[PDB]
Amino acid sequence: KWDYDLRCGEYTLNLNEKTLIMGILNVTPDSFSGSYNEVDAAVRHAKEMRDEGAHIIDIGGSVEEEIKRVVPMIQAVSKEVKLPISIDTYKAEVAKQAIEAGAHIINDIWGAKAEPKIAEVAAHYDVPIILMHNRDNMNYRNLMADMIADLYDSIKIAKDAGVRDENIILDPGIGFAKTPEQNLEAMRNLEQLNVLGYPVLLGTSRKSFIGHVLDLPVEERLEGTGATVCLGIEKGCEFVRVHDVKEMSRMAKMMDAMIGK
Amino acid sequence: KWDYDLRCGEYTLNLNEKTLIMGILNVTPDSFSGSYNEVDAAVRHAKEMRDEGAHIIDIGGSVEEEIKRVVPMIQAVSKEVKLPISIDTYKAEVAKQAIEAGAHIINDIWGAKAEPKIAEVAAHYDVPIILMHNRDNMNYRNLMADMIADLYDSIKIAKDAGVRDENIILDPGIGFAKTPEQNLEAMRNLEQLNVLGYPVLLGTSRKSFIGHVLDLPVEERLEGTGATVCLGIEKGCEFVRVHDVKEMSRMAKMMDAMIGK
Numbered sequence: 001k002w003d004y005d006l007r008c009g010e011y012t013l014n015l016n017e018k019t020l021i022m023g024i025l026n027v028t029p030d031s032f033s034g035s036y037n038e039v040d041a042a043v044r045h046a047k048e049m050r051d052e053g054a055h056i057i058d059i060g061g062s063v064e065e066e067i068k069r070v071v072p073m074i075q076a077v078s079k080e081v082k083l084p085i086s087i088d089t090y091k092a093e094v095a096k097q098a099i100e101a102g103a104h105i106i107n108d109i110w111g112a113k114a115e116p117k118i119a120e121v122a123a124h125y126d127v128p129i130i131l132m133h134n135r136d137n138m139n140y141r142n143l144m145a146d147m148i149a150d151l152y153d154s155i156k157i158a159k160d161a162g163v164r165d166e167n168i169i170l171d172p173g174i175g176f177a178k179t180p181e182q183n184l185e186a187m188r189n190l191e192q193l194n195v196l197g198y199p200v201l202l203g204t205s206r207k208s209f210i211g212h213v214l215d216l217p218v219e220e221r222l223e224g225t226g227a228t229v230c231l232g233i234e235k236g237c238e239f240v241r242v243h244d245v246k247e248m249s250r251m252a253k254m255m256d257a258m259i260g261k
Numbered sequence: 262k263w264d265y266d267l268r269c270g271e272y273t274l275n276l277n278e279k280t281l282i283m284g285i286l287n288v289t290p291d292s293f294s295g296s297y298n299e300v301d302a303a304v305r306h307a308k309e310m311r312d313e314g315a316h317i318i319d320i321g322g323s324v325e326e327e328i329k330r331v332v333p334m335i336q337a338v339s340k341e342v343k344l345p346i347s348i349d350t351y352k353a354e355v356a357k358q359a360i361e362a363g364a365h366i367i368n369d370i371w372g373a374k375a376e377p378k379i380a381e382v383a384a385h386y387d388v389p390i391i392l393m394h395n396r397d398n399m400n401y402r403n404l405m406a407d408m409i410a411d412l413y414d415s416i417k418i419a420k421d422a423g424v425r426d427e428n429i430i431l432d433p434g435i436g437f438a439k440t441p442e443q444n445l446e447a448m449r450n451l452e453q454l455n456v457l458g459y460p461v462l463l464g465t466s467r468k469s470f471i472g473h474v475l476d477l478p479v480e481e482r483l484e485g486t487g488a489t490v491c492l493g494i495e496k497g498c499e500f501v502r503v504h505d506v507k508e509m510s511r512m513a514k515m516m517d518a519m520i521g522k
């Protein structure tokens with residue numbers, strides 16, 4: 001099904017074996033400050049996520065200040081947790097520093113559109129980059145068709161900068177630039193992203209549209225997140241981006257067994 | 262999509278609105294004995310399941326002794342919890358007494374085959390009957406094809422006894438007469454049951470094949486049960502039969518929103 005592996009320097013992610021779990025590192029910063037309390041709680045969280053089945057650790061971030069916060073955490077996690085690190089930035093300079101610090105994958109919520117030079121950073125360090133659907137508006141003519149269009153405009157920016165197809169991952173950008181009904185419509189029609197030929201990452205964890213359906217606060221969205229993860233895997237996604245790693249790994253693992261992955 | 266409602270005497274279940282949750286009543290009997298401790302813990306459990314989103318209460322059971330245990334519980338739950346009760350029996354006499362006691366739906370794990378007269382009981386009291394796939398062996402030529410064949414032999418026994426199509430529900434009998442790999446194959450191919458034209462109930466809650474995939478004890482199968490519930494709803498099932506009503510209702514509810522039910 002995938003004729004290649006996702007190459008991440010020292011680590012390699014097989015795309016056929018199983019749904020790969022991306023753990024969302026909570027990055028609660030110190031008010032006083034790369035301080036000991038914030039980097040240690042990060043390492044501890046990354047270790048916990050590694051222990052409960054995460055395959056990648058996703059680490060998110062004033063641009064100079066963004067780097068000062070995220071760089072130390074990538075250094076500490078990179079050393080202490082043997083897992084690929086994605087950097088959750090749309091800024092080119094932030095991405096540069098993060099891979100330099102030890103990050104393996106770029107996670108861009110603006111799919112190379114907010115700062116085109118990020119794809120150029122991706123191309124040079126030769127790292128996988130996640131291009132997420134996003135726009136500064138909701139004026140959809142046709143949600144899915146526009147989504148796939150907007151995604152292609154990311155692929156073109158990426159390809160034009162030198163990014164190899166094998167380093168391109170797509171993300172439907174659930175919870176971004178979409179109404180709650182449009183988020184459900186995108187979930188309903190997720191399999192359409194497959195025609196683009198790239199691995200898909202789904203990021204739905206605890207998001208507002210789950211709460212909109214279930215009428216439940218963020219800490220009560222685990223079952224709703226599970227439904228989205230399940231439908232997502234059934235519709236072909238290679239990755240899920242989750243806060244609840246233990247639960248979602250068990251769910252991903254069971255989907256896999258059933259769908260024949 | 263369904264041109265009729267599931268009629269259950271005083272209650273009516275719409276088959277289009279949502280995935281209907283069937284709560285599994287734990288029926289821990291007293292060693293000393295329709296005793297107060299066992300009927301009260303049953304009522305309390307049924308009340309709890311009603312509170313957390315169950316649409317039907319499933320109540321299970323020496324044939325004379327089976328009736329003595331289940332009849333009082335149906336009487337107490339029927340009175341105290343305003344929900345349809347299915348009786349989980351394959352015995353005709355047990356089913357007769359249970360509907361007489363207040364049960365609304367027959368839940369037969371042997372699909373009218375262990376005791377054909379049960380369909381006759383169904384036909385007379387004019388109650389919906391769940392015909393589950395089951396056989397006394399695993400000698401499948403072709404799992405899905407044999408399943409759909411074996412299910413039709415139930416529909417014929419039911420129809421021949423007087424059962425109206427509108428009172429027939431089918432169940433793929435997950436965890437019955439199937440290897441763990443065959444259980445996964447049936448989950449993978451559940452949508453095939455839809456060609457038979459009847460509502461499908463999925464019963465996968467906490468079952469051995471989830472533990473076989475996840476390597477987890479029965480009390481750790483909630484995420485794995487959720488995956489099966491999710492795939493099941495995506496594949497068209499009208500009902501899920503679950504122990505964890507709170508969680509599975511939230512999951513069913515989110516699947517519904519996404520798939521457009």
Ligand SMILES: Nc1nc(N)c([N+](=O)[O-])c(=O)[nH]1
Binds near residue numbers: 108130173174203241
């Ligand atoms: N790829 C990806 N990155 C993110 N930061 C999000 N998010 O919700 O924040 C996401 O959904 N997908």
Ligand SMILES: Nc1nc(N)c([N+](=O)[O-])c(=O)[nH]1
Binds near residue numbers: 349393432462464502
């Ligand atoms: N319909 C139905 N009835 C049952 N008793 C079971 N079960 O596992 O015991 C089931 O799965 N389905």
